[PDB]
Amino acid sequence: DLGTENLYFQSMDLRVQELIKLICNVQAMEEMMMEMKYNTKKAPLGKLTVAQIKAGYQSLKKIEDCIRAGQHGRALMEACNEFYTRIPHDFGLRTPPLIRTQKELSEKIQLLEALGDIEIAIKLVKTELQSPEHPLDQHYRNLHCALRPLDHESYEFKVISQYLQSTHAPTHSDYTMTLLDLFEVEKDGEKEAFREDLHNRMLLWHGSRMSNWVGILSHGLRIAHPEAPITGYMFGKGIYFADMSSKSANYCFASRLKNTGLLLLSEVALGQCNELLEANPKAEGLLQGKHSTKGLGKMAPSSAHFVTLNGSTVPLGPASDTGILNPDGYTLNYNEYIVYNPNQVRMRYLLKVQFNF
Numbered sequence: 001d002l003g004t005e006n007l008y009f010q011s012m013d014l015r016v017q018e019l020i021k022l023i024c025n026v027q028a029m030e031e032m033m034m035e036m037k038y039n040t041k042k043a044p045l046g047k048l049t050v051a052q053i054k055a056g057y058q059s060l061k062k063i064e065d066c067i068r069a070g071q072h073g074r075a076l077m078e079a080c081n082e083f084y085t086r087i088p089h090d091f092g093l094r095t096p097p098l099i100r101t102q103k104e105l106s107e108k109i110q111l112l113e114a115l116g117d118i119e120i121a122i123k124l125v126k127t128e129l130q131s132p133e134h135p136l137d138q139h140y141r142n143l144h145c146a147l148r149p150l151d152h153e154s155y156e157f158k159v160i161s162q163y164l165q166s167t168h169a170p171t172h173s174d175y176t177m178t179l180l181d182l183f184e185v186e187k188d189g190e191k192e193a194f195r196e197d198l199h200n201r202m203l204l205w206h207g208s209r210m211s212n213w214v215g216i217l218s219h220g221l222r223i224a225h226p227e228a229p230i231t232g233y234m235f236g237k238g239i240y241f242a243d244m245s246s247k248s249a250n251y252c253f254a255s256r257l258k259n260t261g262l263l264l265l266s267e268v269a270l271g272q273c274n275e276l277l278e279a280n281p282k283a284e285g286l287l288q289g290k291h292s293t294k295g296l297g298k299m300a301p302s303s304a305h306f307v308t309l310n311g312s313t314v315p316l317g318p319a320s321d322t323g324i325l326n327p328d329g330y331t332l333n334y335n336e337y338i339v340y341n342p343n344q345v346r347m348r349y350l351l352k353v354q355f356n357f
């Protein structure tokens with residue numbers, strides 16, 4: 001009876017144990033990378049180094065350069081086939097495909113960010129064979145990030161549940177989400193680094209792949225690699241947030257097969273927003289004193305329904321029309337918020353979500 005054993009040994013809380021086991025699962029990372037077409041046979045994850053990953057970003061940048069110069073053939077070939085040599089893919093018998101659009105570049109970046117976090121993960125979960133500490137306690141300490149499970153009958157749980165449900169977007173109707181459990185997050189250093197002074201502090205969503213949480217929790221949400229192609233970033237190399245739960249939960253890349261994902265809530269010090277109506281990867285240089293970028297959506301939660309939780313505005317839904325319509329092109333469906341310094345972020349809650357397909 002695991003409840004009794006836990007109580008006599010006074011071991012880590014069982015809910016934390018299950019969370020740690022889930023995010024530190026190396027087999028799950030192997031499966032995820034195989035689904036991303038990375039060749040785990042030819043370049044095992046255990047032998048991945050950060051120099052290897054950086055050389056990938058570098059080849060990706062050369063690919064970006066080719067696309068930018070309208071060059072296809074020799075310079076590109078030298079570029080694309082060279083990326084693939086550095087970051088082995090498994091295309092079976094098929095011609096390895098060219099990388100030629102923004103979105104193909106984006107997919108490769110997501111692959112390299114994931115690899116980066118797995119490289120962190122595999123190091124983090126190294127245990128001392130002879131230590132008297134349970135392996136999970138060793139992993140948890142190495143995160144340098146407190147995770148405390150919350151009472152489901154609490155007010156904190158009720159509001160986060162309403163946030164989750166009420167801001168599930170109408171266009172993301174392929175699944176619903178069931179909140180399985182909720183943890184408070186306290187990452188070492190974040191409270192003292194945080195820009196408390198800035199106005200417009202909101203509690204906002206961030207979704208990521210299951211492979212990435214060990215990285216995110218141990219190192220924080222980070223500014224993208226300097227050598228990553230800028231075109232991979234709709235509003236530049238910042239930290240991206242949604243006020244709609246499902247816009248962020250789409251970035252969990254959950255599926256019917258792997259229906260358990262995590263969502264992060266963080267306090268985000270937006271300060272004054274520079275509001276933009278469409279994509280600009282150079283958005284960071286447009287701030288000119290302002291503190292964040294707001295990519296303006298067609299539908300957003302409205303202020304009439306906001307609530308505040310320990311000093312951060314929680315933008316409860318439902319979402320309604322914003323009167324915003326780019327005349328120049330394709331407007332966003334929902335908002336996104338970007339900050340360009342980790343000191344504008346304080347992680348606060350981690351939700352374990354079941355996706356109902």
Ligand SMILES: O=C(c1cc(Cc2n[nH]c(=O)c3ccccc23)ccc1F)N1CCN(C(=O)C2CC2)CC1
Nearest residue numbers: 206207221222223224238239240241242248251336
């Ligand atoms: O926030 C993003 C990010 C996410 C996305 C996709 C995304 N992912 N997840 C979301 O919840 C989200 C919300 C609104 C808009 C986009 C998203 C796109 C570009 C980005 F720079 N980061 C890039 C990846 N991150 C990292 O720590 C890796 C190491 C650099 C965290 C910060």
